A paper describes a structure:
MDHAR reduces the monodehydroascorbate (MDHA) radical to AsA at the expense of an NAD(P)H molecule, with NADH being the preferred donor. We report, for the first time, the crystal structure of MDHAR of O. sativa L. japonica (OsMDHAR) to understand its detailed mechanism. Structural comparison of OsMDHAR to other proteins, using the DALI server, indicated that it has the same fold as that of putidaredoxin reductase (Pdr), biphenyl dioxygenase (BphA4)18 and rubredoxin reductase (RdxR).
Except for the crystals of apo OsMDHAR and the OsMDHAR-NAD complex, which have one molecule in the asymmetric unit, there were two molecules in the asymmetric unit of the crystals. Lys53, salt-bridged with Glu178, participates in hydrogen bond formation with O4 of FAD, which is also hydrogen bonded with the carbonyl oxygen of Pro49. The conserved residue Asp298 forms a hydrogen bond with O3’ of the ribitol moiety and the phosphate group is stabilized by hydrogen-bond interactions with Arg48 and Arg147. The Glu41 and Glu148 residues are hydrogen bonded with the O3B and O2B atoms of the adenosine moiety of FAD, respectively. It is involved in the formation of a closed and narrow active site pocket with positively charged residues, which only accommodates small molecules such as MDHA. In both apo and NADH complex structure, Tyr349 formed hydrogen bonds with two water molecules, whose position was corresponded to the bound substrate ligand in the AsA complex structure.
Author numbering: 4 to 435
Amino acid sequence: EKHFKYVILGGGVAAGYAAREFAKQGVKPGELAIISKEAVAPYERPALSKGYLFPQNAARLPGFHVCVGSGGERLLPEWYSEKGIELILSTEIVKADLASKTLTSAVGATFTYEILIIATGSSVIKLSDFGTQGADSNNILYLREVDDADKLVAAIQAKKGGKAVIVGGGYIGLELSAALKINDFDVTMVFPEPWCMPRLFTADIAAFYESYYTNKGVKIVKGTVAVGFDADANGDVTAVNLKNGSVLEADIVVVGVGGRPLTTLFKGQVAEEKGGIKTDAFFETSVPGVYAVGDVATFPMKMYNELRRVEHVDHARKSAEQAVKAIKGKESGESVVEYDYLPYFYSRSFDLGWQFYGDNVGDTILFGDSDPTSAKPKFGSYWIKDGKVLGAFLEGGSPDENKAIAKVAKTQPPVANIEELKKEGLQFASKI
Ligand SMILES: Cc1cc2nc3c(=O)[nH]c(=O)nc-3n(C[C@H](O)[C@H](O)[C@H](O)COP(=O)(O)OP(=O)(O)OC[C@H]3O[C@@H](n4cnc5c(N)ncnc54)[C@H](O)[C@@H]3O)c2cc1C
């Protein structure tokens, strides 16, 4: 049995950013442990569907450990040993008893704590969850952690020049479809929703991306689902059977159909809402001294005055920092202010890259040049409600442009003249 004053359960983005904040807050050797099922120290997970998959000059650990994806210092394994923060890796916790402050591993070792930060993130929804025949076939792959990324890069090499089907139409599907096309596969994306990234993109933003993708040669099948997967005599996938009747040949299937927060360990022990563990503005759960951060947390989003749960890397970083600040504040009796996050999401694929800030609520206007055949695409959109801007999206922005739309989203300026807005959208944002 090992005991630590502070235990972070999980070794992902929030964990890493929490450890950096504990360092900043003066954690001492022997106080903090991070327990992770992964075999490696915390890393910037968005690289797994971006540089990890590049056919040249690919991202590889230890390059993309935290905190370099935000421009911070890199926290190698030796950084945690130098600080006397114990990294307990390749350790899956399979039971948590909050009353006794005890975690148990799959092999039966126990760990106790005084303060617990739940930073377990999400697991992916699987094709078995849709009851799909043949979901269990080989070469049907998911992408959440670096072990998954290595299996994908190995299949890319094994099946080079083949056919790939990507199931899903959110931003993981978009990034995967683009990765496989860049790695020289024939690619088809399949999803039921009426356009890609339907929880964020408008039909007009989506039509840009869908057009750009088809111009790159990616096929897009919307309005259907897979109902089966054919497999050969080795159990390896060979074809995807769709509800619309089409049969797509496939050497590799890669799935991005969403995730689920990893809250099962705590079911019945903490209050839950919106698919997550409910927290206050300091990331403390219904059990004192147990906090929940990142993808699992359902928290008060101060600027919207509503409880929300978000799966954004920026929030994993910032909520981690907030929870450690709150922990340390309570020790010293020093106050900490309520978390005040501005939603920030981004994605990249091919040569494109977009950023979104604020809330996708209201009616939209598009600005700039949304011809997908442009040399250097650059266009955005505003979400307007009650005559003010609530959300902003930008593809192809400079740093100052991105900062300006972030300031629009944060400040919610009023719109006088829509035709001016639309004709000079970024100038609008720069004057704020
Ligand atoms: C492939 C990919 C690409 C992404 N791209 C972007 C992007 O471009 N932009 C963006 O804003 N966001 C993106 N995200 C989302 C972002 O990475 C997540 O929001 C962020 O990782 C959440 O951080 P977290 O610490 O809450 O969870 P995670 O980073 O998932 O960390 C959870 C950690 O806990 C471990 N763990 C879980 N259960 C246990 C257990 N019982 N025992 C031990 N350890 C356990 C996991 O193995 C993992 O180490 C992407 C995510 C993925 C998967």
